[PDB]
Design an enzyme around this catalytic site. Structure first.
Site, PDB file in Angstrom:
ATOM      1  N   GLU A   5     -14.002  -1.585  11.192  1.00  0.00           N
ATOM      2  CA  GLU A   5     -15.231  -0.901  10.794  1.00  0.00           C
ATOM      3  C   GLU A   5     -16.427  -1.340  11.628  1.00  0.00           C
ATOM      4  OE1 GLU A   5     -17.369  -1.569   6.740  1.00  0.00           O
ATOM      5  OE2 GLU A   5     -16.206   0.294   6.623  1.00  0.00           O
ATOM      6  N   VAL A  14      -5.598   4.919   2.729  1.00  0.00           N
ATOM      7  CA  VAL A  14      -4.584   5.405   1.787  1.00  0.00           C
ATOM      8  C   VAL A  14      -4.917   5.131   0.307  1.00  0.00           C
ATOM      9  CG1 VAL A  14      -3.051   3.376   1.651  1.00  0.00           C
ATOM     10  CG2 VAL A  14      -2.053   5.692   1.541  1.00  0.00           C
ATOM     11  N   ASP A  15      -5.777   4.139   0.064  1.00  0.00           N
ATOM     12  CA  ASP A  15      -6.121   3.665  -1.278  1.00  0.00           C
ATOM     13  C   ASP A  15      -7.149   4.569  -1.916  1.00  0.00           C
ATOM     14  OD1 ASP A  15      -7.893   2.552   0.726  1.00  0.00           O
ATOM     15  OD2 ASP A  15      -8.702   1.167  -0.721  1.00  0.00           O
ATOM     16  N   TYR A  41       0.806  -1.228   0.000  1.00  0.00           N
ATOM     17  CA  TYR A  41       0.000   0.000   0.000  1.00  0.00           C
ATOM     18  C   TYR A  41       0.839   1.277   0.000  1.00  0.00           C
ATOM     19  CZ  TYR A  41      -4.506  -2.416   0.509  1.00  0.00           C
ATOM     20  OH  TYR A  41      -5.623  -3.196   0.302  1.00  0.00           O
ATOM     21  N   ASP A  90     -16.823   5.676  -4.405  1.00  0.00           N
ATOM     22  CA  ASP A  90     -16.146   4.791  -5.346  1.00  0.00           C
ATOM     23  C   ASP A  90     -16.907   4.947  -6.662  1.00  0.00           C
ATOM     24  OD1 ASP A  90     -15.314   2.734  -7.020  1.00  0.00           O
ATOM     25  OD2 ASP A  90     -14.863   1.394  -5.360  1.00  0.00           O
TER      26      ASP A  90
HETATM   27  O1  LIG Z   1      -1.728  -4.474   3.217  1.00  0.00           O
HETATM   28  C1  LIG Z   1      -2.357  -3.479   3.689  1.00  0.00           C
HETATM   29  C2  LIG Z   1      -3.711  -3.562   3.979  1.00  0.00           C
HETATM   30  C3  LIG Z   1      -4.365  -2.447   4.509  1.00  0.00           C
HETATM   31  N1  LIG Z   1      -3.683  -1.296   4.724  1.00  0.00           N
HETATM   32  C4  LIG Z   1      -4.281  -0.096   5.297  1.00  0.00           C
HETATM   33  O2  LIG Z   1      -5.591  -0.402   5.786  1.00  0.00           O
HETATM   34  C5  LIG Z   1      -6.528   0.391   5.049  1.00  0.00           C
HETATM   35  C6  LIG Z   1      -7.829  -0.387   4.924  1.00  0.00           C
HETATM   36  O3  LIG Z   1      -7.682  -1.485   4.019  1.00  0.00           O
HETATM   37  P1  LIG Z   1      -8.346  -1.454   2.571  1.00  0.00           P
HETATM   38  O4  LIG Z   1      -8.301  -0.014   2.058  1.00  0.00           O
HETATM   39  O5  LIG Z   1      -7.697  -2.552   1.770  1.00  0.00           O
HETATM   40  O6  LIG Z   1      -9.844  -1.970   2.858  1.00  0.00           O
HETATM   41  P2  LIG Z   1     -11.252  -1.347   2.389  1.00  0.00           P
HETATM   42  O7  LIG Z   1     -11.020  -0.192   1.423  1.00  0.00           O
HETATM   43  O8  LIG Z   1     -12.171  -2.496   2.001  1.00  0.00           O
HETATM   44  O9  LIG Z   1     -11.583  -0.783   3.802  1.00  0.00           O
HETATM   45  C7  LIG Z   1     -12.811  -0.647   4.459  1.00  0.00           C
HETATM   46  O10 LIG Z   1     -12.941  -1.810   5.286  1.00  0.00           O
HETATM   47  C8  LIG Z   1     -11.898  -2.041   6.261  1.00  0.00           C
HETATM   48  C9  LIG Z   1     -12.302  -3.142   7.241  1.00  0.00           C
HETATM   49  O11 LIG Z   1     -12.397  -4.401   6.571  1.00  0.00           O
HETATM   50  C10 LIG Z   1     -11.512  -0.774   7.015  1.00  0.00           C
HETATM   51  O12 LIG Z   1     -12.479  -0.522   8.048  1.00  0.00           O
HETATM   52  C11 LIG Z   1     -11.375   0.431   6.088  1.00  0.00           C
HETATM   53  O13 LIG Z   1     -11.034   1.594   6.819  1.00  0.00           O
HETATM   54  C12 LIG Z   1     -12.644   0.624   5.287  1.00  0.00           C
HETATM   55  O14 LIG Z   1     -12.486   1.787   4.459  1.00  0.00           O
HETATM   56  C13 LIG Z   1      -5.811   0.760   3.749  1.00  0.00           C
HETATM   57  O15 LIG Z   1      -6.391   1.906   3.085  1.00  0.00           O
HETATM   58  C14 LIG Z   1      -4.423   1.014   4.259  1.00  0.00           C
HETATM   59  O16 LIG Z   1      -4.387   2.317   4.856  1.00  0.00           O
HETATM   60  C15 LIG Z   1      -2.306  -1.246   4.426  1.00  0.00           C
HETATM   61  O17 LIG Z   1      -1.642  -0.201   4.619  1.00  0.00           O
HETATM   62  N2  LIG Z   1      -1.697  -2.330   3.907  1.00  0.00           N
HETATM   63 MN   LIG Z   2      -9.771   1.436   1.454  1.00  0.00          MN
END
Ligand SMILES: O=c1ccn([C@@H]2O[C@H](COP(=O)(O)OP(=O)(O)O[C@H]3O[C@H](CO)[C@H](O)[C@H](O)[C@H]3O)[C@@H](O)[C@H]2O)c(=O)[nH]1
Ligand SMILES: [Mn+2]
Ligand SMILES: O=c1ccn([C@@H]2O[C@H](COP(=O)(O)OP(=O)(O)O[C@H]3O[C@H](CO)[C@H](O)[C@H](O)[C@H]3O)[C@@H](O)[C@H]2O)c(=O)[nH]1
Ligand SMILES: CCCCCCCCO[C@@H]1O[C@H](CO)[C@H](O)C[C@H]1O[C@@H]1O[C@@H](C)[C@@H](O)[C@@H](O)[C@@H]1O
Ligand SMILES: CCCCCCCCO[C@@H]1O[C@H](CO)[C@H](O)C[C@H]1O[C@@H]1O[C@@H](C)[C@@H](O)[C@@H](O)[C@@H]1O
Ligand SMILES: [Mn+2]
Lengths: 291, 291
Positions: B244, B153-154, B67, B267
């Protein structure tokens, strides 16, 4: 602002994002302060939140000279409708302590009679409330209550007035002007007055009869309005609407964190019962001006 | 909450009481928290209010393992759109300090790289943010910023994200669920979990990717969510949506003082650009889940 414990489980209707509570009125100001109308709040949620903080509300009211006659109805209807279930401390400022009626209070509620001087002119009586609230009672209020609510006495409660109003600083939309353009507002328009507001400024016209907030915010407001009135007096000018003119200047420059709709200060005689008002909560009692 | 000086004279359109800003959406919660949509706020007024307090906003973001690739776009677009004109402190938590891109910052803005451990499972990486925000950084944040904003961050900023969001405690409406009934929300439904919410409870489904508030409120939230996750781990259960799920339980029991509309976490790929969204402010970047 003390640690807040969790709310208990509650069963209530789900708020729906794609259904507004009210579509006929503005329910939030452009500075993101709620405007409090019926249908915008769930009182059960708010009561829980404020009870969990053991909130105490002070209510100030002045009853000078003939206005002592309004106290019985004011207080008896406050008992029926004002902050019921919460801790309330009434502060009745009067020149005639013996004329304060003996009103039976619900549990957790108290009344203090504060003797003050009566001034000759009704304008000075109205205006000197700012000084009386701030200078004289600063320390007492800080020790005794969390919020202060400052109202006119020539009034009665007809419906719920509760914790939905509580916030750091609030004013109330004047019932005669809520539909008016700002140029029509009766702000002080003389640049020589501290209350001066030009024709191209102003959010709302707030009525001097219902304002409040945290004790700190109310002491700030009342101190600033008193200081501004003293400057005007030294300069030989008295604002067109007295304390109300100064209150309006203050709330223009220090935005309130909630605004109360005219449900909270209405005159049915004068204005009837328009469709936009679902409840008439706190209303004018006839006073035959020339009391 | 320091003494607030007066706003200067400003010329802007008068809010009109009998004209709602938005009639298509709920703009205030039943506990009188604003729901932040375009058209509900005058940014000039809000910018004045927050600049007069010399507000500093901290932004936390985790970039662990692959990430780190998202940081360049995240930070460069934050420079274009996030709290521009205000003091900003970015806190980038990463297992690869050398992989943080060198991004040019506007004046009054700073970035700190905080090295942390990488956990194997993406679920644990996501979940351990609560501990990292609270336990490790408590003292630093209290000394350095007034508000904390905690985001995924994504993501990229496409439009204004500013002081309209700031308040003691906020969450953001999840873009997939803002029109859903509460029974359809993907809350944790097992009573054995600390995150459990029954089918007849719930206001909103908040997304874990955008939450914040004052430092004190954010430390309270993150501490409570971390403690609840630890209880679940000791009991051999992991909430359906990890952090979450816990965030949702917390915000059910501790109502946020503002709610951000899905403008603030969208999104476009997945959901398009519906009529109810006038702006898409902070949006998902493609991540090919199985990153
Ligand atoms: O390998 C990784 C995985 C996750 N993250 C961090 O964790 C965040 C959350 O993970 P994702 O963005 O992959 O997951 P989602 O976009 O599906 O996230 C949603 O679901 C999650 C719980 O499953 C969290 O609650 C998250 O904040 C919510 O936006 C990332 O943005 C990043 O900041 C990392 O840095 N590295
Ligand atoms: Mn995310
Ligand atoms: O002889 C008096 C005159 C006034 N008051 C007190 O002053 C308050 C304000 O006076 P009025 O109620 O007679 O005046 P209005 O209802 O016209 O008041 C409006 O205009 C005023 C300024 O002119 C104030 O700002 C007031 O709060 C606002 O509601 C009264 O309720 C009462 O509490 C007295 O006690 N005795
Ligand atoms: C008959 C009088 C009608 C007055 C309409 C305007 O009301 C007055 O507006 C002033 C500011 O322009 C100031 O607030 C006094 C206010 O009059 C008071 O409030 C009214 C709603 C009535 O209750 C009136 O009797 C009262 O004096
Ligand atoms: C294709 C996937 C569509 C997913 C819709 C539901 O989104 C997910 O909802 C979960 C709670 O039920 C949790 O918040 C993760 C969320 O998925 C994230 O957010 C979505 C809007 C997408 O950006 C998705 O890629 C992302 O993983
Ligand atoms: Mn009156």
């Amino acid at each position: 602002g003390e640690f807040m414990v969790s709310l208990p489980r509650m069963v209530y209707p789900q708020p729906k994002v794609l259904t507004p509570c009210r579509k006929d009125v503005l329910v939030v100001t452009p500075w993101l302060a709620p405007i409090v109308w019926e249908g915008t709040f769930n009182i059960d949620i708010l009561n829980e939140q404020f009870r969990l903080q053991n909130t105490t509300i002070g209510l100030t009211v002045f009853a000078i000279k003939k206005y002592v006659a309004f106290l019985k109805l004011f207080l008896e209807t406050a008992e029926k409708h004002f902050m019921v279930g919460h801790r309330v401390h009434y502060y009745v400022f009067t020149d005639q302590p013996a004329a304060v009626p003996r009103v039976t209070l619900g549990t957790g509620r108290q009344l203090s009679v504060l003797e003050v001087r009566a001034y000759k002119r009704w304008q000075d009586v109205s205006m000197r409330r700012m000084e009386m609230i701030s200078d004289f009672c600063e320390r007492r209020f800080l020790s005794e209550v969390d919020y202060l609510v400052c109202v006119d006495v020539d009034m009665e409660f007809r419906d719920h007035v509760g914790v939905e109003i509580l916030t750091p600083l609030f004013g109330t939309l004047h019932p005669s002007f809520y539909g008016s353009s700002r140029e029509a507002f009766t702000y002080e328009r003389r640049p020589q007055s501290q209350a001066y507001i030009p024709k191209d400024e102003g959010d709302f016209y707030y009525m001097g009869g219902f304002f409040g907030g945290s004790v700190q915010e109310v002491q700030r407001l009342t101190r600033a309005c008193h200081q501004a009135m003293m400057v005007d007096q030294a300069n030989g000018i008295e604002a067109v609407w007295h304390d109300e003119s100064h209150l309006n200047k203050y709330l223009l420059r220090h935005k309130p964190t909630k605004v109360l709709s005219p449900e909270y200060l209405w005159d049915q005689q004068l204005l009837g019962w328009p469709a936009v008002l679902r409840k008439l909560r706190f209303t004018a009692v006839p006073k035959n001006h020339q009391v």
